[model samples]
Target: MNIFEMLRIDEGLRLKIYKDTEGYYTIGIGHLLTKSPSLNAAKSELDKAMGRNTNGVITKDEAEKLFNQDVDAAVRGILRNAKLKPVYDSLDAVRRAALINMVFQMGETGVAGFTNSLRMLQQKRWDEAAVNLAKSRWYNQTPNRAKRVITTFRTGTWDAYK
Candidate 1:
């Protein structure tokens, strides 16, 4: 497949900013917030593409490269962190996807903060885990998203949100 097609498949296209799985500002297929020279270079390229100085946009190619680098690294870190690795590996694939999705928005540290919910998950207490997940500040901030994530964990259906 072509690079653009591959990125569309892997990162999923978005035309606007959305909070990524790590709560960072992201746009155009998972470009994370960064101040590196490469990020500036991408912005410069995007500005040149638009023929104006502006923010809130990026090219597909920029996003593809950034996603392959930053987003992948974040997911790798989530899967390797001491607090999340074992539990992450123990879950079923559907639940695992849900967990990874949530971890992406929350980050490994943020996901780790869901102590009660994680503990309940460990015990196979789906209802309690869902309840605990709903009790967090994350839930308070984004009830719709939290509900989806909690529902996925509770039901073991990856598409519970959909």
Candidate 2:
């Protein structure tokens, strides 16, 4: 089975798990990137890969989890089917997957979920999409992270490697 099937995030479990995590963002008192390939890692990976994350550091295990598996599965499950389903037919997997990584960590229905932004994207309203993406809770909670991914979406020159 693919990584999405393996993670079960595709089965409408992203937000549920987001609720479970309770906005911890990291496990343990001072664990930092301590949550394996789960929510924390996804978030941490988004931040670092996108040049937005500045809290701490993602361990080797965290990096492995994100680039090797987390990103792909996240796209298949949450991002690929975002609201309105934008015109990704012409985009590369890396760009789509990077945004997916952000949405996965931010939940697929919340302010940072990419639903409305995607609809804007479908119309090729790049400027609007970028603005909307930046005006969300994700941007506020993690400014650097949001800027990194949205900038990539706008420029298509973003380098997101976990």
Candidate 3:
């Protein structure tokens, strides 16, 4: 399955800014405006992306474009990290996408924290990697999404969710 299709379903797009489940400002395919580090900064970037000042809105096309750009940065970061480059290349497509999925939800820096556990994935130690992620607060806090992603990691296949 395509990574865009996976993420489009995993993190639904929004044209208007809204507080996420955790109460941070987010918009357009789960893009975290607050990640700019302040609401003002958030507005600035939003306006920059939208190509016009607005209250809280984006075109579907604009959002999709933003999603694509964000994914590029995500891909680059995954490949740039020394510890993860070989490990990432070692996985199958489904499992590789799961890594990107996790990186999307939790920023690249967040994924970097799981260095050794993620490396377990490099050796194809599926259960160890699965169980390792399952033990984290990421699993407990976002069980719904986390379960599907880790299962993809374990099975190396994308199962129908609907």
Candidate 4:
């Protein structure tokens, strides 16, 4: 798949990633962080978290593992995608990384669901762009990450470490 297609990957696949070859769910980087209660059920549960499917089969223990994976993947993928040479040619590595990370975790389409923030970026209004990021439901989801990245975009440094 193309880069955007890969980055904008379907959440269904994220759940599928949690599943093993036998369609059982395993957590934490391969089988390194395995869980109990039917791996298939865990996959479906993660699907629910992504709004793909709701089997009501996930347990609290499984919930923690899935949530962590989701967050970690979102963050890492964002950073990686932003660092691509083409994308980096446009924005600084740190700013792009922070923006992508925040946008992915908050749901890129969902956060930039509005075009205004994008317009801010297009206009090169760094301060406003960062401010616009904070003015979202996602800002509430993970303020620390958001704040850190926003700071990065503002200061032009990886100091925020989003």
Candidate 5:
């Protein structure tokens, strides 16, 4: 079996929504559901991925199969909603990769919360975006990772934030 199938075996597919060990709602091969400012964003993405509403149950097998496709949906959703799309396109592929990685971790809506940083980016003010990124709550929570992203945002390199 490939990596995704291995993950399915490790994660243990479940058809019904159940509280995970951490007490968060989870279903369909460990798909976690939680409240967010944009409630249902993930669900909508999943529904789009599966081409059907969750409707209380989904086969463990189907969930595993849809995983990769769902990831693409998530990425596309992020780029569409991320106010910095124009700026994102302006950067080289590696720099875009760094930003996309950040969005993957933070979620489209979560990353969109970085209003000032995104606006600075849209303005092509790399230094200002880097400064704003450093001052963000995300940066406070994940300093090392945010530093990498900030560095790439400003310098298009993987070096530590300068």
Candidate 6:
């Protein structure tokens, strides 16, 4: 599958509200509504994604729409960072999708913290980049996902696992 489709499978779709790892309200392919008033959009966005006035459930179509929006956010978010945009632009199609996946999983700020690691990608230093990433809390949290990401960087390939 393509990287975006892989992301949706890896991310898992949930139509109902649930607390995320940070204890904030989230639903449908990892959309975070608040936690820090922008929560006002919480209900409305949820409704928009739900699209069913009859209840608070969302459809696969709506889920895909929200996923696309989130992917766009991550895409725009990465390009906005002057530091990451260059690094991201320099990678191959396979590797760039890997980077986009990381930004989607973690915020641009989170990926940007890989100061030395990003340079590794820029230089196509494969194994070195993977080594650096393996040391992070992000990796520690979900190496199942993170390992595939590391492997993608190390080998310039694409993969997904749930």
- Encode model 4's per-residue lDDT on 92-137: one tens digit a residue: 6566655555454445445446466656665668899788878876
Q: Give one digit per residue, the lDDT tens place, for model 1 in 113-152.
A: 8877888887789998888888778888767767766787
In model 6, what is the error at residue 101, expressed in angstroms?
Answer: 1.1
Candidate 2 lDDT at 119 equals 71
- The candidate scoring highest on lDDT is 3
The clash count of every prediction, one per candidate, is 3, 3, 0, 1, 0, 0
| Regions of candidate 3 where Cα sits further than 4 Å from its true position | 35-41, 160-162
Model 2 / residue 137 / CA error / Å = 1.1
Pairs that clash in candidate 5:
none
Tens digits of lDDT, candidate 6, 1-162? 566876776677888765667666677887775553444456666676556551445677777888888899888998899989999899888888888889987789888999999998899889888999899998887878788888888987554343
Per-model TM against the reference: 0.68, 0.52, 0.92, 0.47, 0.55, 0.84
Residue pairs of candidate 1 with colliding backbone atoms = 21-104, 21-105, 22-104
The sequence of per-residue lDDT tens digits that candidate 2 reaches over residues 1-162 is: 232332232212221113223344342111223345567665665465536663444444444454445455545555355451344544555456445545556545453345677777666677888898788766887676567677767765544212
Q: In lDDT terms, how accurate is model 4?
A: 0.51
Show where candidate 5 strays beyond 4 Å. 1-71, 82-84, 160-162
Which candidate ranks first by TM-score, i.e. highest? 3
TM-score of 4: 0.47
Once model 5 is optimally superposed onto the true structure by TM-score, how far is the C-alpha of residue 159 displaced, in angstroms? 3.5
Residue range 61-109, candidate 5, lDDT tens digits: 6766655554465558756863757656776765666666566455677
Task: List the candidate 1 regions with Cα displacement exceeding 4 Å.
Answer: 1-13, 16-25, 34-56, 68-71
* Residue 129 alpha-carbon offset, candidate 3, angstroms: 1.2
lDDT, ranked from best to worst: 3, 6, 1, 5, 4, 2
Q: RMSD, each candidate, Å?
A: 6.4, 11.5, 1.8, 11.2, 7.6, 3.0
Model 5 — which ten-residue stretch has the worst lDDT?
1-10
Off by over 4 Å in 6: 36-45, 48-55, 159-162
Global Cα lDDT for candidate 3: 0.83
